[PDB]
Swiss-Prot record, chain A:
Gene label: rplI
Family: Belongs to the bacterial ribosomal protein bL9 family.
Protein name: Large ribosomal subunit protein bL9
Function: Binds to the 23S rRNA.
Other facts noted in the record for this chain: Binds 2-aminothiazole antibiotics, which are antitubercular agents.
Domain of life, per lineage: Bacteria
Length: 41, 63
RNA sequence: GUGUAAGUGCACAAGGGAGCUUGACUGCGAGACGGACAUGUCGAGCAGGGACGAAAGUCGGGACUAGUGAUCCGGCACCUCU
RNA sequence: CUACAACUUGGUAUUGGUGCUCGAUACGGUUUGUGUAGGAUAGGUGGGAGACUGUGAAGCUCACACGCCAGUGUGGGUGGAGUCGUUGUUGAAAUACCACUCUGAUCGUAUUGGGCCUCUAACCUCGGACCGUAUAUCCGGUUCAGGGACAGUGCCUGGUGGGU
RNA sequence: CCGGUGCUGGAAGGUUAAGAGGACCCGUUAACUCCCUUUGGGGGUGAAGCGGAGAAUUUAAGCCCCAGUAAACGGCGGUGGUA
RNA sequence: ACAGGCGUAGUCGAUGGACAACGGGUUGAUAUUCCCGUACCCGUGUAUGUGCGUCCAUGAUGAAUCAGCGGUACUAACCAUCCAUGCAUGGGACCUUCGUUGGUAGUAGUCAAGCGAUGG
RNA sequence: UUUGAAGAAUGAGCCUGCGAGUCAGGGACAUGUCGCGAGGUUAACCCGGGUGGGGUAGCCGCAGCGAAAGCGAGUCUGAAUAGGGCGUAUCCACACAAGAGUGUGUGGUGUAGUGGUGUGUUCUGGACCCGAAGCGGAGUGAUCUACCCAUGGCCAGGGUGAAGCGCGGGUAAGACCGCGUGGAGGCCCGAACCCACUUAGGUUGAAGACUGAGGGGAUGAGCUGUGGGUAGGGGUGAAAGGCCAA
RNA sequence: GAGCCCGGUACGUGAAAACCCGACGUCUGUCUUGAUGGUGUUCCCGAGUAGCAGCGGGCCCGUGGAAUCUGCUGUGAAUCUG
RNA sequence: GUCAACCGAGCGUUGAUCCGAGGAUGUCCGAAUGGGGAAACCCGGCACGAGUGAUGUCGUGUCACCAGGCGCUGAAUAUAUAGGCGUCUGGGGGGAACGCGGGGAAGUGAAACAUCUCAGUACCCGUAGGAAGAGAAAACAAAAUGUGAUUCCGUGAGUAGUGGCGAGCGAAAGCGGAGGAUGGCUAAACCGUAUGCAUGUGAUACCGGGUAGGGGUUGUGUGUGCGGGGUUGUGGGACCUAUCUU
């Protein structure tokens, strides 16, 4: 889903970089430990 | 396995039509998946039965 | 001898041969036969457009009687229907 | 004869990551073009009379490719001041420059599936230890240890199916 | 006795579902193109979009296929002559 | 799906385990039940007497301090192996640390009547 | 019921009571009868303590033919006034045509339906009444019987003599052989107990499975007591299609 | 076998208390910091929803060219020139 | 009281017997609820009383489970949660019919039978109410300058259709009536306010303009809560922006 990365995640980008990612990855890796935030504004 | 713990989605009832049009009763169960969710950011994990539609809706919090 | 079973006929030929040809038509059809009903069968004659013939005339398949399957459902072609 | 339970195959959702390995078309593309009129293996149309050059051309030696080994292309070395044009062939020009591309092997950018080995977080464990708990081989939670995107399950689907 | 039917093992091939795939064709009409007439309909072409049938290609088990298995279900012959 | 199916802690469930009474007499009908004689088993109160204990006192004990020395072994080193000088290895010891004993601290401490488990 | 039964085809012991074409629907057809009549008639509902009054929504007649567009006393098929199908209530008279059966026109005559209700059939309802084996839904049953679980009880009496052990013989040691002790066995005979092989009785029985004589097992794969569990397309079955309350 | 014998009938009368219906009030909220008709632009108008696909149910409609409604599984939009 | 009298005793003009309304008492079982249990019978705890020289004994209250509020505590474990403790408010079962939402047969008819019918019937499950459900157009309709929430009754109509086009099944539009409430409330865009979570140019920033302060009506975001504002189809409402103003 459309989201904004929080910290450095390797193979994705640097902090502040917006990335499109599959649902399973985002819901099971990024969101639970705050490596990515959904895009609001 | 047929009643969602979030929205209460239940199985549907119908018939299984054959080539000779023999109608026999059958059931349409929901796609219930057992998911360990995180009710509050405190970290407690509980095993709940949520349909895949609920998972798609983000109503379950598997944090 | 008549394509083919038997019967009824056919030498006046319906049997044999030759020429042209596609009526092995379209719209019909008075009157009948037979039949519980559904089927089935014969049909003069009218109009169109043709074949043969000099003409009169004959031709709506085969000398006749067997060679076939109702209804429902679906396919194809045409229609100035919806 | 017609169905079903049950078992079983595949797709899809739960379901994720990194890499190898293949195929489709898109893009910057190299690449391939043997009637004969002949300097001659002319892809046609174009802007098309001067362009490449010293970001080192003709003439020569090597590597590879195809090879109709006709010979061309690229890479490098060698040499240092040329090929060329309506040059005349022709429907059709110059292989002098520039603007897509068609017969055809290729590369780096996309997307996309196909398979393979893996990683852990989804999920699973009737494996261990603690806690609820005083009693608990139930259950739930925490954690450790293992599998692991497989399995199980949902929808669709092909088979076996007197078991009914 | 493995010829038949089961069971077990193996896919080198043939066939094969759903799902992916959407060539081609058709319906509708924005736009045009011919009329044929007077107080606008009648013929054709027809972009895009929206739809309807939908092909070539890919695909597992199974079946066909290749072997074993009878203390698996089963089977185990006639004719003529001759001292 | 629902109705419901199992089942933990529990709680029921004798046909079993534990648990103190025998002989005689009497009535129209009951009798190890009533009466007679002699017992046995659980509790309650009163009184009396021995005889322990807390308060008091006496025993039983032992824990911990500093200081006095040898072996683990922060680390620099020595020996040997030693890869190429370096290291790893093994061994003696330094510091910390561990073990022994002179003072303290059988004094402060704990226990010593009696009940005693839902636990072993 | 029969071709045919006085019966040797069926049913009835007798009497008194009871016992079989009924009802609903503006249903469908036919036929009486009544009202109105080219019209007839209301349903729901409203108002009346009633059986009365209102209620035009509909329904049936009033024009047919054609699949339909549509036309219309005509219409369809058809190239066709060229014949056929359906229709113009029916009759009468007059003409003109034919004697392929009669037709074509001019006048008259003028068309009868609808709503109650009786009757006979008929449609949907159990539909004249009586009569199965059997099929589904939900429940009740293991106090009989089949098997299993827990916990107890019982088996008079008499025989046979396994393993083991001891002594002796024997041998280098054994093997082995005699004599004793021992008391094993889905062992033997035979009461209680459990079965049920034969025969006789019983067979409107004492008894909806018994009795009299004999018979088999009888320390076991035994019998039995109390408590408990398995339930119908299911149970259980040392397997008979057996048993699951005659 | 009763209008004139009785209980009664026509017709009038009756509630201490409880309950049920109304009515007027206390009480409660509520508008008054308000109301009107005009002018040209940005935002909003109900989301895992509608739509689509697969398998079904029910509609006169038995899958049929099958519209509207609805269950499960995938996929999944727009906010009014929607 | 009565069967149903026979006694024996007594009450009533100081109003009995009897009828109506409201109270008190109401053993035990039964949802049964302190625990147990073969329903109506066994065993208890706590508190306060009664009784005994004391135990025994008696009386009155209270003691089930689950769900939701409120308060305390917060395991493994750190945040915390699960859980535990206490206290209040509810539920549990019964009922003849009617309602709604689910699951859902077979005998039967088709002269057999499987599609179909029977029938969404029988039955079962969950639930109410005095009625229930539906109900205010993302509606019908067909060019009528048409109706205007739902429900129910009569027509439409055994029609259009549907169906191994078999047995059978079978609407809707429209029209006529009963009743009328063509009824109301919200969510969003915007404001104001409070709070949670992040941070903060932490100042020239947020009040409607002009003056002057100030470094937070937070400055910014984001979420939630509350109060305003907004209920619509000729689109409506917020953002604006003039005019008039009880």
């Amino acid at each position: 889903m459309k989201l904004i990365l929080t910290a450095e995640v390797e193979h994705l980008g640097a902090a502040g970089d917006t990335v499109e990612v599959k649902d399973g990855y985002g819901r099971n890796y990024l969101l639970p430990r705050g490596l990515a935030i959904v895009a609001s504004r | 396995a047929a009643v969602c713990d979030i929205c209460g989605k239940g199985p549907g009832f119908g018939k299984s039509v054959s080539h000779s049009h023999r109608r026999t009763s059958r059931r349409w169960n929901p796609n219930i998946q057992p998911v360990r969710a995180v009710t509050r950011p405190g970290g407690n994990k509980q095993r709940i039965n949520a349909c895949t539609s609920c998972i798609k809706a983000g109503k379950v919090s598997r944090a």
